[PDB]
Design a protein around this nucleic acid. Structure first.
Ligand SMILES: Nc1ncnc2c1ncn2[C@@H]1O[C@H](COP(=O)(O)OP(=O)(O)NP(=O)(O)O)[C@@H](O)[C@H]1O
Lengths: 326, 660
DNA sequence: TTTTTTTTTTTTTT
C-alpha cells in the first residue's frame, strides 16, 4: 500500500469555516499570534513567517527567466531570542521542508553524486537537503556558522534558484525553488545592537541581497517588560494552529491574487521615499528589496483570500519593511 | 514447453498492405515510387515514412473502403518489427536500372557489384541461401510523428503523439514508438557500429555472413565452406573489414525538462541510440521533439546478478524535430538610409534596460570591435575591445552582457565561478563516461574572435587572472600543463561586469580601492564604465514605475522606441568589420595633440586621488582602435576628425563618474 | 564458470 502521513481533506463544512473566518479583516494578526503559543510578541516576525508560508505566488516569464515569488528571510540577535525554538514551530505546521543546524553540506541540497553507482553499473545522484526542500521551508540554525564554501551554492539556491551539478557527472540543472529562513547570531558577543550592520552581517555579501528581511532581535532589558517576560514563561511549564495549516494549504492553490495598480500607486512612492530617506539612516537599498514589496503584498493578498491584490495589502508591506529596518 | 496462444495480430496480410501502401498512392506521381528510386538512384539515403501518410492512406483504406486493419496504433504499439517487414518488401518493387549507377566512382560499390558478380559467377560454375537483403541497402528508414491536425480524423486516443517526460515513461512502453522531449546531454561522439561483416576464408574461400543481432555476438572461424572444410584439415578464415558494413551509431542521453517533474525527485535522464542518416542530428544541450523505438537490451553481465531480469532497456532514434532552428544588405538598407547608425543602434542595445545610453554607446563599439591591423612583420595590434564595467551591486548589468553575447557574434557569457582557469586554459580534464583524457578549453578558447562576457570578475581567483592577464597581450593562451606545451589562440574579445567588494563602492574612497583586481590589470582594458546607483527622487520614480510595468505588462517600452532586432543588426555589424578604415593623417595628428594634454592633465594631477593616469599609450591605442571601430559605424574608411572626437567624448566620460 | 568500484567524509599538515 505505502500511504503518506503527517494535504488535505476539506469536505465542505470545513472550508465553509475557512471562508467564514476569511471574511474577517483582523484575521491576519490573529493567525500571526497563534503561531507562537509560548513566545512573546515578535508579531512582525510572525506575520513575516506566514507571509513566507503562503509562497507569495509566482510569475514565470514567457521565453525568459522566472520572477521568484517565494520568500527568503533571516533572524539575527543575542542568544536566547528563541530563534532556534522559533524555527522548530516552522518545523511542523509548515508542511515540509527540512531544517538544518549550520552544517550542512556537502553542498546541502547538492546530490554530491552517490559513487560509485549503486547499482548495476549506473552512477547515481540522490536527493540532497535543499532539493528535498523544493517548494518547502529550508531553515537554518547558525547560517553564520556554515562554511564559506557552502555559501557558493547557497547563492545558487536563492537568485539562480536552481542546482547546477558538474561533479562527475550529470550536468542537470534542477529546480531549487524554495522558501528559506535562517538565523544567525551576532558575530561577536552582544554587540549586535552597538555595532553597525556592516561587520555584524557575519555572512557578506550577496547573501544579504537575496534576503527579503534581516531581523535584529535585541535581548535588551526592561524590568517593566521583564515582569511580563517572567510570568508567561512560568505559566509556560505549568486562534487554532492545526486549522491554520488546513487554511494556509487552501490559500496556496486557491487562489493567486495577481495584482492591482492600487498597491502600485503607493509602494512606489514608498520605495523612492526609502531611497531618499533610508540612506540618511542606514543601508542597503536595491530594486530587489522593492521586488519584495510585490512578494509581501502578494503574501498578505493570499491572507485576505482576495481574488486580487489590494492597496491595504500594500499597507501591510509598508508596515513590514519599516520594522525591518527600524 | 513454451505455451503458445492465438492473437488478433497477424503479420501475413499486413505485409500485403505494406506493398499497397508503398508505390500506390496519390495525395503526396506518388512519393513512394520515385523517391525510393532516388535512394536506388543514390541521391538520397534516409527513407522518411510518415505516420501522417499512414493515417491519410488509411483514409484511402477505410472511408473510402474497403476497410483495413490498424496501422499507426499497431505501429506505435510495437515499433520495431515494422522496420524489418515494412522495409523488407521495399526490395521487391525497387527500380532496377536505376539511373547512372556507375561502379567506381564509388569505393566498395564495385566491391559489392563484384561481390555478387563473383558470387553468382562462382555460383555459376557450381550450377553448371543468398546474401541477406539487409546487406544491400544504403538506405535508412525514419518514421516521423503525427501531432496532428489531421490526426483529428479522428482516431483520438491512439495518438502519442505527446512528448511525455521520462517520469511519464513507463515499463509497458517497451516496444512502443513514441515522442519524448528533453535536453541533450553528453551526446556520445559518432562511431561506426557494424552490419554483416563478411569474413573471408583461406584455402578454397567462399564466405559466410554472421548476423549482427543484439549488442554483442560470438565471433567464429572454423570453416563453414564445404570445400575448405573436411579437406584439409580445415580452411582458416579471417574477417575482411572492407566486406563489412557499418550502420551509423551515435548514442545520446536526453535529460528531463525539469518542469515536467514533481517538486522533489532529481532529474532522470534516459538512454537513447542513434542509427543512420539521422546521425549528427543532435548536439549537446538541445531541446527537441525526439521520437523513437524504445527497446530492452539486456544484458552482457553480471547476468545471474540481474534478476529480474531487470532490462535497463534503451531508446533508438527515429525522428528529430528541433525547436528554434545583397538583399540582406537591403534588409540593412532601411538602417543605412535611417541615418544616425551610431546613436540609434546605441539605443537599440539592450532596449530592456532603461537609462545610461552613454554605456550602451561604448557597448556599440564592442559589438563591431575592429578593425585590428597587421604591422607587416607581423604582430597584431588589437583590434579587440576589452572594455569593462563597474559599480554595484546588481544594476542588471548582467543583462547588458546577457543580451550582448546572445546577439554579438561568437559570444561567451561567463563569470568568476564561472569559467575556471581550466575553464579558460586548455588542459586535460578527464572525460566522464566515454573515455579518455580529452581536451576542452573553455571560455577564451571556446568562442574565439568573439566577446568574452564576465561577471564576478574579482572572484575568478588567480586561476583565470594570470592567463587573462596574458590575454590582454591577446593573441595567445599558453599551456605547459601535462605533456602539451602549446599556446593556443584566444582571439577572444574581453568584457566583464566588475562587481566591487562588499557592499558598494564608497564615493570618498580613492579609485581602485573598491576594485580588488591587480593594479597592472586595469591599464590592460581600454576603458571602463563605473555604474553608481544613487537615489534620485526623480529617476527612481520612473524606475519603480519601470519595475511595476512588470508584472502588469510583458512589453516594457513605449512613447517611443522600436527595438532593433539582432539578425538585421548583426549583418550590418558584420558588414562593418569588413570595411577596414584607414586613418587620414590630419585626424592622426589631432589624435596626437589633444592626447598630449590628455598625457598632461592625468599627469599634472600628479598624486592618484582621482587618477588613474597617465592616459597611457593603451588609451591612445584604444582611442585609435575606437575610431577604427567608430568609422565602420559610419562606413567611411576616411576616419573623420569628429570620428575621432566621438571616442574622445567617451574617454573622460568613462572616468570622472568616480565623483558622484 | 567468472563476471565488477572513485566520491565524500574526515584527517593532520605546511
Ligand atoms: N518567548 C520567548 N522568547 C525568547 N526565548 C524564549 C521564549 N520562550 C522560550 N524561550 C527559550 O529561550 C531559548 C532560546 O534559544 P535560541 O536563541 O532559540 O537558541 P540558539 O539561538 O540556537 N542559541 P544561540 O545560537 O546562542 O542564539 C530556549 O531555551 C527557549 O526555550
Amino acid at each position: 500500500t505505502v500511504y503518506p502521513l503527517h494535504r488535505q481533506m476539506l469536505t465542505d463544512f470545513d472550508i465553509r469555516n475557512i471562508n467564514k473566518l476569511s471574511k474577517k479583516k483582523d484575521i491576519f494578526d490573529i493567525l500571526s499570534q497563534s503561531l507562537a503559543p509560548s513566545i512573546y510578541g515578535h508579531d512582525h516576525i510572525k506575520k513575516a513567517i506566514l507571509l513566507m508560508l503562503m509562497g507569495g505566488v509566482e510569475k514565470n516569464l514567457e521565453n525568459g527567466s522566472h520572477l521568484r515569488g517565494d520568500i527568503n528571510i533571516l533572524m539575527v540577535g543575542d542568544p536566547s531570542t528563541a530563534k532556534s525554538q522559533l524555527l522548530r514551530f516552522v518545523l511542523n505546521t509548515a508542511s515540509l521542508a527540512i531544517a538544518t543546524t549550520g552544517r550542512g553540506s556537502s553542498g546541502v541540497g547538492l546530490t554530491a553524486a552517490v559513487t560509485t553507482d549503486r547499482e548495476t553499473g549506473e552512477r547515481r545522484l540522490e536527493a540532497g537537503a535543499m532539493v528535498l526542500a523544493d517548494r518547502g521551508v529550508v531553515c537554518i540554525d547558525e547560517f553564520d556558522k556554515m562554511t564559506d564554501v557552502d555559501r557558493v551554492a547557497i547563492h545558487e539556491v536563492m537568485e539562480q534558484q536552481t542546482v547546477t551539478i558538474a561533479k562527475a557527472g550529470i550536468h542537470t540543472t534542477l529546480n531549487a525553488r524554495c522558501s528559506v529562513i535562517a538565523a544567525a547570531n551576532p558575530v561577536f558577543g552582544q554587540y549586535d545592537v552597538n555595532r553597525d550592520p556592516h561587520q555584524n552581517i557575519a555572512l557578506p555579501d550577496s547573501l544579504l541581497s537575496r534576503f527579503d528581511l534581516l531581523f535584529v532581535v535585541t535581548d535588551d532589558i526592561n524590568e517593566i517588560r521583564d515582569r511580563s517576560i517572567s510570568e508567561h514563561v512560568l505559566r509556560t511549564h505549568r486562534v487554532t494552529i492545526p486549522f491554520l495549516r488546513k487554511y494556509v494549504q487552501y490559500a496556496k492553490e486557491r487562489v493567486i491574487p495577481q495584482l492591482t495598480q492600487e498597491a502600485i500607486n503607493v509602494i512606489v512612492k514608498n520605495y523612492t521615499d526609502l531611497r531618499n530617506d533610508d540612506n540618511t539612516k542606514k543601508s542597503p537599498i536595491t530594486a530587489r528589496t522593492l521586488e519584495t514589496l510585490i512578494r509581501l503584498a502578494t503574501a498578505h493578498a493570499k491572507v485576505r483570500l482576495s481574488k486580487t491584490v489590494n492597496k491595504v495589502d500594500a499597507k501591510v508591506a509598508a508596515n513590514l519593511l519599516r520594522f525591518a529596518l527600524l | 514447453a513454451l505455451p503458445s496462444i492465438q492473437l488478433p495480430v497477424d503479420y501475413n496480410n499486413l505485409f500485403n498492405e505494406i506493398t499497397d501502401f508503398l508505390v500506390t498512392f496519390k495525395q503526396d506521381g506518388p512519393k513512394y515510387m520515385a523517391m525510393l528510386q532516388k535512394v536506388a538512384n543514390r541521391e538520397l539515403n534516409s527513407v522518411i515514412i510518415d505516420l501522417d501518410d499512414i493515417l491519410q492512406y488509411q483514409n484511402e483504406k477505410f472511408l473510402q473502403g474497403t476497410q483495413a486493419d490498424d496501422l499507426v496504433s499497431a505501429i506505435q504499439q510495437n515499433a520495431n518489427h515494422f522496420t524489418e517487414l515494412f522495409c523488407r518488401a521495399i526490395d521487391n518493387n525497387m527500380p532496377l536500372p536505376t539511373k547512372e549507377i556507375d561502379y567506381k566512382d564509388d569505393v566498395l560499390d564495385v566491391i559489392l557489384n563484384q561481390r555478387r558478380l563473383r558470387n553468382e559467377r562462382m555460383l555459376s560454375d557450381r550450377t553448371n541461401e543468398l546474401f541477406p537483403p539487409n546487406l544491400t541497402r544504403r538506405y535508412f528508414l525514419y518514421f516521423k510523428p503525427l501531432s496532428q491536425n489531421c490526426a483529428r480524423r479522428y482516431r483520438k486516443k491512439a495518438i502519442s503523439s505527446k512528448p511525455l517526460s521520462v517520469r511519464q515513461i513507463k515499463g509497458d512502453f517497451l516496444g512502443q514508438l513514441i515522442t519524448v522531449r528533453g535536453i541533450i546531454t553528453r551526446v556520445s561522439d559518432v562511431k561506426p557500429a557494424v552490419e554483416v561483416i563478411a569474413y573471408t576464408c583461406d584455402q578454397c574461400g567462399y564466405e559466410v555472413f554472421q548476423e549482427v543481432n543484439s549488442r554483442t555476438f560470438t565471433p567464429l572461424s572454423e570453416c563453414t565452406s564445404e570445400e575448405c572444410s573436411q579437406n584439409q584439415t580445415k580452411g582458416q578464415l579471417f574477417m575482411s573489414t572492407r566486406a563489412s558494413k557499418f550502420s551509423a551509431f551515435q548514442e545520446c542521453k536526453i535529460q528531463e525538462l525539469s518542469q515536467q517533474v514533481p517538486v522533489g525527485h532529481i532529474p532522470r535522464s534516459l538512454n537513447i541510440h542513434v542509427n543512420g542518416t539521422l546521425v549528427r542530428s543532435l548536439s549537446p544541450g538541445d531541446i527537441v521533439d525526439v521520437t523513437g523505438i524504445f527497446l530492452p537490451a539486456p544484458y552482457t553481465g553480471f547476468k545471474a546478478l540481474k534478476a529480474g531480469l531487470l532490462t535497463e532497456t534503451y531508446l533508438e532514434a527515429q525522428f528529430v524535430r528541433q525547436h528554434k532552428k545583397s538583399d540582406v544588405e537591403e534588409r540593412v538598407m532601411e538602417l543605412i538610409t535611417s541615418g544616425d547608425v551610431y546613436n540609434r543602434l546605441a539605443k537599440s542595445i539592450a532596449p530592456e534596460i532603461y537609462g545610461n545610453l552613454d554605456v550602451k554607446k561604448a557597448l556599440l563599439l564592442l559589438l563591431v570591435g575592429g578593425v585590428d591591423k597587421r604591422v607587416g612583420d607581423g604582430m597584431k595590434i588589437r583590434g579587440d575591445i576589452n572594455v569593462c564595467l563597474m559599480g554595484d551591486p546588481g544594476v542588471a548589468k548582467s543583462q547588458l552582457l546577457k543580451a550582448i553575447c546572445k546577439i554579438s557574434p561568437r559570444g561567451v557569457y561567463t563569470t568568476g565561478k564561472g569559467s575556471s582557469g581550466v575553464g579558460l586554459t586548455a588542459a586535460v580534464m578527464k572525460d566522464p563516461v566515454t573515455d579518455e583524457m580529452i581536451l576542452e578549453g573553455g571560455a577564451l578558447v571556446l568562442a574565439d574572435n568573439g566577446i568574452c562576457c564576465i561577471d564576478e570578475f574579482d572572484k575568478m581567483d588567480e586561476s583565470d587572472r594570470t592567463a587573462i592577464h596574458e590575454v590582454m597581450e591577446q593573441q595567445t593562451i599558453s599551456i605547459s600543463k601535462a605533456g602539451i606545451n602549446t599556446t593556443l589562440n584566444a582571439r577572444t574579445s574581453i568584457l566583464a561586469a566588475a562587481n566591487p567588494l562588499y557592499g558598494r563602492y564608497n564615493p570618498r574612497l580613492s579609485p581602485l580601492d573598491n576594485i580588488n583586481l591587480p593594479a597592472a590589470l586595469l591599464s590592460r582594458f581600454d576603458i571602463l564604465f563605473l555604474m553608481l546607483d544613487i537615489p534620485s527622487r526623480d529617476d527612481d520614480e520612473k524606475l519603480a514605475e519601470h519595475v511595476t510595468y512588470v508584472h502588469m505588462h510583458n512589453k516594457q517600452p513605449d512613447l517611443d522606441f522600436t527595438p532593433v532586432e539582432p539578425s538585421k543588426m548583426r549583418e550590418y555589424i558584420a558588414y562593418a568589420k569588413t570595411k577596414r578604415p584607414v586613418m587620414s593623417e590630419a585626424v592622426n595628428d589631432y589624435v596626437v595633440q589633444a592626447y598630449i594634454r590628455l598625457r598632461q592633465d592625468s599627469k599634472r594631477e600628479m598624486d592618484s586621488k582621482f587618477s588613474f593616469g597617465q592616459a597611457t599609450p593603451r588609451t591612445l591605442l584604444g582611442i585609435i582602435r575606437l575610431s577604427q571601430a567608430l568609422a565602420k559605424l559610419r562606413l567611411a574608411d576616411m576616419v573623420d576628425i569628429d570620428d575621432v572626437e566621438e571616442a574622445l567624448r567617451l574617454v573622460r566620460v568613462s572616468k570622472e563618474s568616480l565623483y558622484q
